[PDB]
Amino acid sequence: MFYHISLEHEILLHPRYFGPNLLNTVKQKLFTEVEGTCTGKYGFVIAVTTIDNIGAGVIQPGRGFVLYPVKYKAIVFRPFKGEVVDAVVTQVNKVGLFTEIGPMSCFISRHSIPSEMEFDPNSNPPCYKTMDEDIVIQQDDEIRLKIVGTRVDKNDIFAIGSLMDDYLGLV
C-alpha cells in the first residue's frame, strides 16, 4: 500500500565533494541511499518526489565529515494488516502461494487457502486449480489478497497474505 509522506535523513559528505555541486552531490547521495531501502516503520521507499530542505551541514569534530540533515517527500509502500490490495502472483508451488504487491513480496500458505483449490503438477505450468477448473491461478495472474501480518528480515520486509475472506482472489 503506497503512501506519500515526509522523511528525515542524514548524509555524511567526504571533503572531496566540497566545492561546486556540493548541494547537487548531497541530492545525489540522498537519491542513491534513500531510494530502494525499506524500514519497518515506513516500508519500502519507492522514490523521492521532492527534496524539501537540506539542513546546515555540521562539521563533525574529527574525521572531517560534514553531516547534512535532509528533509524530503518520498513515496513509501507500506502494507497493513487486513488490507486488500490487488496483487500479482510470481511463483506457485506446493508449499504456498508466492505473490507480489509492487515492491512487496507476499507468501500465502495453503492452510488459509480454501479447500476448493488443489495442487496439480500435471498442468503445463505448475499451479493450483479447482476440481471444477473455474478458479485457476498461474504466473503473472492478478489476484486480490488481504495482508494478515508484516515482518522485516535483514532490512527487507516480507508479508503474509490470506484468502479466507469472501469476494477475494481472482477477479
Binding site: P15, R16, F18, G19, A56, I59, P61, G62, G64
Partner: protein, 82 residues
C-alpha cells in the same frame, strides 16, 4: 539568530581560530578543493593558514549563547587577530 542584531565579538577568538584551522587542514588533507591559489604548498595546515589570511575558509562558526540561542558567523565575517 539572523544576520542582524548579532551580539557577539566581531573578532574571531583564538579557540575559533585554532579549531577552524585544524578543521580546514583536515578537509584539505582529505582532498577538499582549495579556495586560494597555492604556490607550492603541500602542507594542509599551511594551506588552511593562507586561506584564513585570504578570508577563504568555507566554514560558518556557530556561537551558542548560554540561553540556547546561536549566531552563525562566517570566517570571512570575523576579523582575524593575525
Amino acid at each position: 539568530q539572523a544576520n542582524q542584531k548579532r551580539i557577539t565579538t566581531p573578532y574571531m577568538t583564538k579557540y575559533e581560530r585554532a579549531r577552524v584551522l585544524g578543521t580546514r587542514a583536515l578537509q584539505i588533507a582529505m582532498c577538499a578543493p582549495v579556495m586560494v591559489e597555492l604556490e607550492g604548498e603541500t602542507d594542509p595546515l599551511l594551506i588552511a593558514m593562507k586561506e584564513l589570511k585570504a578570508r577563504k575558509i568555507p566554514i560558518i562558526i556557530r556561537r551558542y549563547l548560554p540561553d540556547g540561542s546561536y549566531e552563525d558567523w562566517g570566517v570571512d565575517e570575523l576579523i582575524i587577530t593575525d
